[PDB]
């Protein structure tokens, strides 16, 4: 993809009625890090599934192992869960040449606080201003009220 979504705002897509070649991507190695959980990095397009999902988001290099089936970590536990009952591959490309800007990338918004941790394969794109304090948010930012 030219561009991904943030982790919290996880971009979900479903594969059905087609064939994707997972072993080809692994061996061409256009992504720098390939880790697979419950599935093989190769000879995987020989395994039959009816609903294959391939979803896109952005993480840091130290987070690549965290976003994975059966794994935990700050990103895996708070902004995108992947339970032990699921299997799949986590494929990561360093996009620094397209996405990094001096001053930061404002097209991707990272979630720090949620009232509860985000669920398995849940997408949430909300920017509703977070209520941290006792004084309710009025649709504007203020102390203990922030995007």
């Amino acid at each position, epitope marked *: 993809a030219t561009r991904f979504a943030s982790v919290y705002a996880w971009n979900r897509k479903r594969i059905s009625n087609c064939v994707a070649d997972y072993s080809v991507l692994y061996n061409s190695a256009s992504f720098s890090t390939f880790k697979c959980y419950g599935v093989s990095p190769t000879k995987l397009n020989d395994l039959c599934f009816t609903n294959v999902y391939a979803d896109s988001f952005v993480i840091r290099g130290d987070e690549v192992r965290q976003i994975a089936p059966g794994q935990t970590g700050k990103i895996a536990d*708070y902004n995108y869960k992947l339970p032990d009952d699921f299997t799949g591959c986590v494929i990561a490309w360093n996009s620094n040449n397209l996405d990094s800007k001096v001053g930061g990338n404002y097209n991707y918004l990272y979630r720090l*606080f949620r009232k509860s941790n985000l669920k398995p394969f849940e997408r949430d794109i909300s920017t509703e201003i*977070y209520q941290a304090g006792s004084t309710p948010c009025n649709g504007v*930012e203020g*102390f*203990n009220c922030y995007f």
Partner: antibody
Amino acid sequence: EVQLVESGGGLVQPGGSLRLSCAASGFDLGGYSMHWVRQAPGKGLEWVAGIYASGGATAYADSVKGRFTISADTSKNTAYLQMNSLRAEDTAVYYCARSYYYGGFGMDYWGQGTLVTVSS
Amino acid sequence: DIQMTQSPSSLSASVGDRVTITCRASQSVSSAVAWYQQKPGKAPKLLIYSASDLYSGVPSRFSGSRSGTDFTLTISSLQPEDFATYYCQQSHTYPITFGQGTKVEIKR
């Protein structure tokens, strides 16, 4: 390398006041709140006050509410703390610090501290 | 007003050993738990800015994780320059509070 630098320390008579200042170096204050943190002799850290650099919203620690006032200025890339009605118990090293938004993040930027004493 | 408690008040570890500090807020502060290092005469140095994130410029020796409500705060391989009083901080809400300070001995 990003650092903050405190100034304006000194001595206050009980019931008096002192104004602290801190300048940021190596980064842009916008997007972060500016905070003041205190360490009295024999004590660990206690947060005192803070303001959002890009919004102007403020809040204070319960221990200083109604007594302390703060401000920040992103064109100067500096910040201030006005401490009135001080007592001997407020003797402490005051530190400047900055963090994202209005909270939830730690002090991404931190200074060296300046000593403020109060005494009879 | 959310208070923080730490335990133990001191830990004994030699150079190369591990130091573990347990800290918790009285109320949830989510992932926002920081860590500072203080030597006599100096400002505490920020090590961790949030429980979830290590501060830039800080050695990889310093790390931690969450389980339930608690924050396990640790030094994986203690160095001579790490013998300092450490503080745990929550920064979710105001006032921002800190624990009591945990000291480290070098097993002499």
